[PDB]
């Protein structure tokens, strides 16, 4: 009724918001930088004093000390080298030799130790957050699930029925089978589930240009993961990362395999990881190198490989608990049709078999829209379908 | 990357045999029982068209008047054995004048099952059930694509084996007639089938102590359908 | 001069080291098999003349290296591409190690796994005196590795190490020691305080890890 | 910016206007709030004397810097230009959210303290794999394939244009859609009507470039490349041509097949990551489906396959008439005796006998187009 009586009202006060908010300061877009009305706090005062008495304090790395007097070795970025002295704001206890500190740059002495690099392609590789896969979503190999499971969380979790019995807990395992049966979709519930520190690694990130540059970068893992108190590994797709040493006239391969090296190095040998829990998964395990496969380095071994029935009629009630259908169809007739059929397999035709109600005009699938579903996802596409040399892992 | 087909497992078994036990499970499901009154037997055909001819297809086959056979995974080379069988009956017949049994039959295709090989070349991809009644009343037994068999009481073989194995142990037991033994199957055909059943899907025959291997046809059958 | 230990790798390499390591009150030094390996060129090869010095320093010192197949590879002739920076390393090793001034100060301890990687210029005959292998431990040491692992558990005397080493062939100290923890686990599973034979009898098959399928029709 | 998201009744409502009504009072409320405060605290102006203040603060020879780690209590570590990095501290006008390792920050000329951070000027890559606009027509271009581009719309366009009918049946759109076929079977010319129709940001990359010379940068090209498609939009990235990473070997790669691996692996992690993948399709195509990995074509990396048959003679005389559309054909022409010439002619081989054809018309500087053009074309095209 009051068509325009309620749009220019609507409009002018649209307007009016920013025609006083312009009064009030959030403009002048900027080229890097804050909010005006916010950081009113160094205004008057850090102004003039977070600047004028802070110095820039330069920092350091130190080389080492010697006896009965400070007398420090130091050590900068490109420049030379001095015989430097603490501050007395610090004990000379925590001055410890290789360690970065924060000095002056007139009378070269130290104030503060600093922590040592990480190489924050490294830290990139920690997750700081968990996905949402849950337990009950790898449902058919709760063997796998269980035997897993109770290496990698009980002794974190319950750090005393290990003790008290008197027995130290394994610390390496490897996860393999075909593709798509669950390896990796069963390291985000582990992901899921944890809390500490969740340091995942793809082995093809370490192919470095340089030589012994993935190496270092290997020793700077393991530099962080001593820091933390407990730790979980991954690895992911580690044939990337080595195979095994078969070195004929050129050297071929050379560079992977040192790299390989150092990491059979820093998981056995000379006071080890300690509280570290590594985790690795391949593909085709046939091509690993055996003192890889030497244990105390990967001790739990689980296969994946597909469900008799009743797992794969379970993965059709995982997949399919949550999609309009016929109510009346039942499953076990498709995991009879789906005999050598992995659950991505299985969660495919779930989302094709809804694709077939959605071709012309309907809501919920039914039983023969499943079958639409099995000759063409099953029998049209297998052609290629990828498995069976992968059964035999070559 | 190509392996021998005379290959051990590093499990110690074999490859491609190994091969044939998962071959064999995309086959029809098939059941027999052996009660003391007699056998009976029963396996669907999975019907494809309306077009097909649904007769020409069958499982059931017979060697001789007390014995048949059931046979499940593929089917084309299966009747050379089907055949090495009834040869089998004749020469024993030819030289003893009197009928083969049951087992020593069992054994020599068997025998049969694993030859395999370089000289003189795969295994066979078949399951089967072996009806008849001897001497000793009557017989069924199951073999193996590695030429393993044993006598069965009640044996289901095929896509749903497994599952209808547990629902088979459950109601089967020593006492059991040939009358509730039927109808006892085909509620388990019925629930383990896609298609409804009807007299086109399935087919029967027994063998009996009193008459010979006899087959049943769809005049006689679809009785114990509205009976069941 | 020159001590070398080879053979398979769950041999217990390592663990002499760290014995020693416990035994002599002497500088022992160590080193990781690609430690010598650096992105610029020649900071290895000082690293080695650091190396050699210090314990050139230290009159009483040994030297262990680990895994020398990093750096210990067999020379080659090809045109066209070839690594040479690790053989630079590879050849102050050599000389800086044995050649012109020798020295009797340091006592050098190498292991390995694989020999025919191994350029024979370090395999001469004084650069690496002394070069033994591991064999795998033969029954009786099979026993005894597993009778030294299985001693902070909770024991009934259910056990027989000569039953356990003898259906247990083909085993090296690693796997030894794994049974010992996976019957461990086991009998944590069935909530068991002592230890009986047939943990260790499970242990066994998860060490030996099968591949399961279905094989009950045998015998 | 951002006031108030709610336009639920949208009709002529007392509902509507009361709504801003209130929010009429309340920005009056902002007004007069603000407005005694400077009416009762003149004493700057507020507009450019704190910011004058905050630029008298910070100097002119403002240099510029980069992180490389965090301590909270607005002091960090940040490396110089030069690499002889410091130990400064922060500012309050540093907004400290924007702040990530590796970023640009500005700094004093004195102190070098931490002053302000630095919009970064995007990356000459992202524009260079970055498609600009649509590529040509629409769908209604091509012809006579009728089905696929159903199935393209399928797995493609109808998750965009209508996010209900996924949430209606309880399900997600398929993930990887791949094309095979013949060469010149209009692989790539199906992907521009795509390109055309998008709304996306979209992305193209042949798989002969993914190679290099130097070691790992051929998967370290991947990991940027799907960061970049990740940190978009919805994302449309397409792959051509993936079989040529397998087929020829090239002498400029340093690694041999032993590092074209490598780059799959990369590659092979980056389609079925255990990370949150986001809203990117991938689209691939080429004509030697039989020959890489299966292990990239699994279902849960590529959910659906498309093959693209040779036309049939009542397609092909479709196709005819799309390439012979626009032009001014001379009625010399029999179109279908153009159409058996060759058994199993590609809608390339159409296009390239029509406009050879009018470069045979143009030599002879004519409008229209005769028999004898199409005569001595085929003669042209095919035969050689
Ligand atoms: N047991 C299962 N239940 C449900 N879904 C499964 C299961 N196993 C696999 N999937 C499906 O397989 C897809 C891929 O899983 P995952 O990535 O773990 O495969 P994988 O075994 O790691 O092989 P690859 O390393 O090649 O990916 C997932 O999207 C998931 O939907
Ligand atoms: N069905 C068709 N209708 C119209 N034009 C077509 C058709 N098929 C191919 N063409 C013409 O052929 C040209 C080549 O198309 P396109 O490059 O997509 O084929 P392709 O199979 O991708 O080729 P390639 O195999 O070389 O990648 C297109 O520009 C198009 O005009
Ligand atoms: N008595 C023993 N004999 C052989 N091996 C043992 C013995 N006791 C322990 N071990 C195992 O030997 C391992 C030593 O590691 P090692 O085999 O030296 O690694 P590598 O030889 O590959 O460098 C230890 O992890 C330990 O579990
Ligand atoms: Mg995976
Ligand atoms: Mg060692
Ligand atoms: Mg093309």
Partial sequence: TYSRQIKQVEDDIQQLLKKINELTGIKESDTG?????????????????????????????????????????????????????????????????????????????????????????????????????????????????????????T????????????????????????????????????????????????????????????????????????????????????????????????????????????????????????????????????????????????????????????????????????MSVERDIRFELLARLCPNSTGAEIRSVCTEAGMFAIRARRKIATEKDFLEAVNKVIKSYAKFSATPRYMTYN | YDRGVNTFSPEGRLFQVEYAIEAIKLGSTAIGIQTSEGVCLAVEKRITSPLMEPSSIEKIVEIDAHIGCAMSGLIADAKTLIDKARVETQNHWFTYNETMTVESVTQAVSNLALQFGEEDSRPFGVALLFGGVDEKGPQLFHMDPSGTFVQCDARAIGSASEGAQSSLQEVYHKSMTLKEAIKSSLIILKQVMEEKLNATNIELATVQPGQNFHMFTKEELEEVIKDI | KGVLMYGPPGTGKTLLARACAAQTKATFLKLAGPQLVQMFIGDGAKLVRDAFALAKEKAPSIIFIDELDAIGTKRFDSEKAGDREVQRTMLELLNQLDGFQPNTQVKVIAATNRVDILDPALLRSGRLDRKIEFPMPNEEARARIMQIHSRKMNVSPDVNYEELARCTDDFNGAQCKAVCVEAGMIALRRGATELTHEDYMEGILEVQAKKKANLQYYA | ASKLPLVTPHTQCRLKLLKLERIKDYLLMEEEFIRNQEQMKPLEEKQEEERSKVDDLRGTPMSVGTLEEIIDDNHAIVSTSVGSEHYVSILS?????????????????????????????????????????????????????????????????????????????????????????????????????????????????VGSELIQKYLGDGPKLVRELFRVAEEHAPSIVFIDEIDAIGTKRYDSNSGGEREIQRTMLELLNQLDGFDSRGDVKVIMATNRIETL???????????????????????????????????????????????????????????????????????????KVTNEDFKKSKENVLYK
Wanted: charged fraction near 30%; glycine fraction near 6%; charge should be negative.
């Fill in chain 1, 155 to 322: 002794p974190l979790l319950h750090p005393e029925r290990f003790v008290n019995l008197g027995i130290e807990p394994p610390k390496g395992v490897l996860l393999f089978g075909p593709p798509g049966t669950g390896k990796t979709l069963c390291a985000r519930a582990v992901a899921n589930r944890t809390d500490a520190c969740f340091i995942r690694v793809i082995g093809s990130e370490l192919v470095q240009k340089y030589v012994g540059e993935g190496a270092r970068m290997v020793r700077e893992l393991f530099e962080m993961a001593r820091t933390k108190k407990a730790c979980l590994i991954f690895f992911d797709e580690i044939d990337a990362i080595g195979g095994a040493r078969f070195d004929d006239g050129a050297g071929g391969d050379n560079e992977v395999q040192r790299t390989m090296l150092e990491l059979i190095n820093q998981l056995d040998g000379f006071d080890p990881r300690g509280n570290i829990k590594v985790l690795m998964a391949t593909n085709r395990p046939d091509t690993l190198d055996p003192a890889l496969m030497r244990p105390g380095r990967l001790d739990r071994k689980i296969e994946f490989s597909l469900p008799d029935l009743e797992g794969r009629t379970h993965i059709f009630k995982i997949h399919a608990r949550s």
């Fill in chain 4, 93 to 205: 006008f540093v907004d400290k959210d924007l702040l990530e390792p590796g970023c640009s920050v500005l700094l004093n000329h004195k102190v070098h303290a931490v002053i302000g951070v630095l919009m970064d000027d995007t990356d000459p890559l992202v524009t260079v794999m970055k498609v600009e606009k649509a590529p040509q027509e629409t769908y209604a271009d091509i012809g006579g394939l009728d089905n696929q581009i159903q199935e393209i719309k399928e797995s493609v366009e109808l998750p965009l244009t209508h996010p209900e009918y996924y949430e209606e049946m309880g399900i997600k759109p398929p993930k990887g859609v791949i094309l095979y076929g013949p060469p010149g079977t209009g692989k790539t010319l199906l992907a521009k009507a795509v390109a055309n129709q998008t709304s996306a940001t979209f992305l193209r990359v």
């Fill in chain 4, 293 to 367: 990995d299966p292990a990239l074509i699994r279902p849960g990396r590529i959910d659906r396959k498309i093959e693209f048959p040779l036309p049939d003679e009542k397609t092909k005389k479709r196709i005819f008439q799309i390439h012979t559309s626009r032009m001014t054909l001379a009625d010399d022409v029999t179109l279908d005796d153009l159409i058996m010439a060759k058994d199993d002619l590609s809608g390339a081989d159409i296009k390239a006998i029509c406009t050879e054809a009018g470069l045979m018309a143009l030599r002879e500087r004519r409008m």
């Fill in chain 1, 33 to 153: 930088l804050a909010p005006p009305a916010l950081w009113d706090l160094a205004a008057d005062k850090q102004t003039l004093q977070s600047e004028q008495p802070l110095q820039v304090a330069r920092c350091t790395k130190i080389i080492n000390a010697d006896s009965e007097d400070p007398k420090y070795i130091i050590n900068v970025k490109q420049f030379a080298k001095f015989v430097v002295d603490l501050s007395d704001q610090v004990a000379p206890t925590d001055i410890e030799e290789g360690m970065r500190v924060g000095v002056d740059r007139n009378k070269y002495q130290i104030h503060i130790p600093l922590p040592p690099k990480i190489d924050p392609t490294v830290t990139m590789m920690q997750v700081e957050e968990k996905p949402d896969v849950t337990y009950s979503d790898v449902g058919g190999c709760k063997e796998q699930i269980e035997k897993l499971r109770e290496v990698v969380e």
